[PDB]
């Protein structure tokens, strides 16, 4: 609806388009921040339960 309202705005001034990355949001490879933290926290999990 937001995209539809933008389109009709300015008596058809600009071309509005929707984009839905969606399930691609998970990514192909984890970032370095993710890799570094996954390691810190996994270590802390094991230290706790064990």
């Amino acid at each position: 609806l937001i995209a539809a309202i933008i389109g009709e705005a300015g008596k058809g001034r600009f071309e509005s388009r929707t984009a839905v990355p969606g399930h691609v949001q998970q990514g192909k490879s984890p970032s370095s921040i993710d890799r570094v933290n996954a390691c810190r926290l996994a270590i802390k999990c094991c230290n706790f339960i064990e």
């Binding site: 399930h23 691609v24 998970q26 990514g27």
Partner: protein, 48 residues
């Protein structure tokens, strides 16, 4: 007057290769890989 076909679609007759179709193919291929990988993580299909 010379035309060098340039479309991600490859709808122009005269060529079997339009400029930008490999760029496009590769970006969509990278997108589909991530989607299939996600399907592989969960008995699920994706309509792309």
């Amino acid at each position: 007057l010379v035309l060098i076909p340039a479309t991600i679609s490859n709808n122009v007759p005269g060529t079997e290769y339009s400029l930008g179709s490999d760029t496009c193919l590769n970006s969509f291929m990278e997108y589909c890989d991530v989607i299939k990988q996600s399907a592989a993580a969960t008995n699920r299909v994706f309509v792309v």
